[PDB]
Design a protein around this nucleic acid. Sequence first.
RNA 1: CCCCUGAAAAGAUAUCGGGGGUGCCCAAAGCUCGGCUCAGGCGGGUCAGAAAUCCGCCGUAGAGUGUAAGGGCAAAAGCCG
Lengths: 200, 169, 98, 178
Amino acid sequence: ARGARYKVPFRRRREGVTNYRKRRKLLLSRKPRLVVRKTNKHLIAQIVIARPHGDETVVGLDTRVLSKFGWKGDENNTSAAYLLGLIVGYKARAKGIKEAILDIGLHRPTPGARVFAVMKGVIDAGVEVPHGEEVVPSEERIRGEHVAEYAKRLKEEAPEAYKARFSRYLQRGLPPEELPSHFEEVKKKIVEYYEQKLAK
Amino acid sequence: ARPARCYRRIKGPPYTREEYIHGAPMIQIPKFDMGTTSAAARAAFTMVAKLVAEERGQIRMQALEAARQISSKYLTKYVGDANYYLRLNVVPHHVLRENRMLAMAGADRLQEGMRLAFGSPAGRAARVEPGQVIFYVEFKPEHLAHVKEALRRAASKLPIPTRIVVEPK
Amino acid sequence: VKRTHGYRYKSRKLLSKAPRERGMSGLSRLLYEYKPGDKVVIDIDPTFISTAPHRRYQGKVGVVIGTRGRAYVIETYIGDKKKIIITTPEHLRPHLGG
Amino acid sequence: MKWKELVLVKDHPMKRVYIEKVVVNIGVGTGGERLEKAANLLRELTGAEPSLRRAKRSIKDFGIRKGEPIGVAVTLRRDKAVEFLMRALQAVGNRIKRSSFDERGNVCFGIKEHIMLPGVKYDPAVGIWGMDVCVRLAKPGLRVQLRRRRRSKVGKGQLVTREEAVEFFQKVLGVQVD
RNA sequence: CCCCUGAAAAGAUAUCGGGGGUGCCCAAAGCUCGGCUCAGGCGGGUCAGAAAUCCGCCGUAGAGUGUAAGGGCAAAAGCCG
Ligand SMILES: [Mg+2]
Ligand SMILES: [Mg+2]
Ligand SMILES: [Mg+2]
Ligand SMILES: [Mg+2]
Ligand SMILES: [Mg+2]
Ligand SMILES: [Mg+2]
């Protein structure tokens, strides 16, 4: 910056995306990393193997893949996080990965978070990811019953606020009060697809 | 004081870190630039005379001071302070040591001979190289004889051979 | 006085770093998987000095003999005596000269 | 006149200025009971839970040690901030010095005695206290500096200037700025 | 016994050589997780002041890190919980 004695930080540190202390602790594991990242619209899930010249991503997907199975919920709610985790876990199991270590980056590990929803989906697909028993969200939140209850109360109380706050659901054709059943159908579709693929 | 031949020769590393030297002497030279020191008035002066060392050695602070007084007094008396700029170009950074039994100067100075022979500070000197510029004079070309005489008188007080080099600015 | 011999007793220049080298170092040295028979160079990292080998092994070429948990066992020589350096990968570099 | 429509709007939707927050501070010397009185006074005055502020450095001329609480401050946002801001401006007199505005959308004013606030009664068990009230104004997009991931610097055009803050206070809050 | 220099860019290296320290201290000054950023400067702010708490801008470490010297350390090895 000013003078030769200024030490410019690492590029990823100064862009604010890599905590190198946590990255070094993760790299000590020598296991594949289940990288989970959040955006304002989507959730990114990757299975990464670190190499000296650059990381190798075995499988990488955001929540745009759920449209292939017919998702009509939000892109990055807890149910979408679970379905993305299921797909990424099945793909990783196909490509030969059987264990992974959760990598949430700069996100906080609060219990019931979407990163743990993705981890639960990956675990249910057949990939072992170590975790505490008190961080994975409840099955009600994974099915999306919180979204349904909020939509029901909003419809009862303020219908115009309901339409404004869930317009994209109504454009997609799924009212938010029917989210758990649709989650069940999509999860059945994904499970049947990848299990038939695994059998074949 | 000892004869200057005792400290003329460079025989060891420089001894200048005053944060590690105990009781280091002060530099007694009161000023280093003589005459018309402001560059706006030095723009008039076009001749440069340089008293330059011929050998490698050490010049004591007192020797540098004596040369400075003799040259500055001659230049003031015969050229006037408004017609010259004189700079003593070297600073006596080196600290000289002497090994001698003495007064209250440590309990290891009370042992005689070469036992605990690391001396106490005894003065200051400037370590010079061949071709090093000891005295730098800026002057108008009419005063060349007086400037050479002042440089000769200054050279008479120094412990090493020197020479005068005249050139244009 | 005779020379004192701490574990790091003449290591000012060897453990100093330039201003452009300050702070954390890159993590690529962690990701080299050395097999038995590989050749490595002992290049001490000053930021992890507690696990670094002695200063007498800096710049020496060793042969990986095995792995102990997360460190590597390296067979090297100091003059003519065989020495065993058990050190983590952050103080090692692969030897490219064979 | 509520928080959501207390906005000063320019010719761009994303350059709307609003009250980011209002912070109320009482700095008392040391006292346990004195600080408890100050904390309760802040709680009643603002409706929000105060936070105790510990001394950062031990200064023996003030008789304060580092880590001990000597302040009570509360951060107000949205509706509570606007209500107390109106009350505090009424207490000060609907008047703010032009030199009180810093060059980055911050304006702080002192309330010498809290009885001047509307709706406050003198109590002998609390005494009479003073406060610093600091209003921080912002434009949309300030989260780029305060978020955790990909934290960066907000561009110069999207930052609140002193002129915009004074114009906001005049035209929107109806305060006399001199 | 320990650090820097001597020590001559591998290793080793002495003098009643130079500059210093050691015979402790700490249930937290030890372990870990998380949050935060220091010295210092500047603008605004009741008592309040050079210096208290508060709002903001700058700030490569100019702070701190028990204790010598040297080395290391900034989403930390510092500060707080
Ligand atoms: Mg010699
Ligand atoms: Mg010996
Ligand atoms: Mg240790
Ligand atoms: Mg050597
Ligand atoms: Mg210690
Ligand atoms: Mg830490």
